């Protein structure tokens, strides 16, 4: 459980400790640490540190437009379409690893993302027009 401890465990047990996975990835790699410094290792270190933040910030930009700036688990007001999966409540959470589930939505994973921005943020932050001051 020190890192990816529940990679093979159930999606429910993996959902119990998903903080750990998030903590190590951005921070990890110990990047922090003749006269030249133009060596082949330093240039592989810098670009490896650039995608470090540019893959982190690629994901953190998505949660910000979903109301999840500082939450590891948002429940979003987007209804689930039956075409994406036909399995019941306890059918997936007590049976599949997150690995199996990632390939089962990888086909229509982009369709979900586009709809998440519309109802949870594009409309929700607008619904306060009549409720902010009245």
């Amino acid at each position, epitope marked *: 459980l020190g890192f990816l401890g529940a990679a093979g465990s*159930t999606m*429910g047990a993996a959902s119990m400790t998903l903080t750990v996975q998030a903590r190590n990835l951005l921070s990890g790699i110990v990047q922090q640490q003749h006269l030249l410094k133009l060596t082949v290792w330093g240039i592989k270190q810098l670009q490896a540190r650039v995608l470090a933040v540019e893959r982190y910030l690629r994901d953190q930009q998505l949660l910000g437009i979903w109301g999840c700036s500082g939450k590891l688990i948002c429940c979003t007001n987007v209804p689930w379409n039956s075409s994406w999966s036909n399995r019941n409540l*306890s059918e997936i*959470w*007590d*049976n599949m690893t997150w*690995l*199996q589930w990632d390939k089962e939505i990888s086909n229509y994973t982009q369709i979900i993302y586009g709809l998440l921005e519309e109802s949870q943020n594009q409309q929700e932050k607008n619904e306060q027009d009549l409720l902010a001051l009245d």
Partner: nanobody
Amino acid sequence: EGQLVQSGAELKKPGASVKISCKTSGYRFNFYHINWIRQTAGRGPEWMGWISPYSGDKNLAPAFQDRVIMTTDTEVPVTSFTSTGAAYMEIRNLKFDDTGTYFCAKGLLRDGSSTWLPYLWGQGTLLTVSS
């Protein structure tokens, strides 16, 4: 979604001791439990004992824990999510009351609320304990 198939068609004398086997395919053999049941000439089929292919911690029936004991070897992984394994069981004593058809079945789910109950069943084995 994983087909389970039994050996089938083994029969011996009443005071004998035979083992039955079950070929697994199409499901990860590590965590799905295996259990066994039997239907007699009597109307009601009864449950035997459930085995876990990992850890081996098992809770067999109290009326058969003294005579019947079953083990199960490891598995050979086909892919990351499909694998094929085997489960055996040995019974020491039996009579004409122990004759009938025997099934094995895949464990329901790999979680907490309920796992021990079967799910997918095999084609089954029928055993005649007629002398």
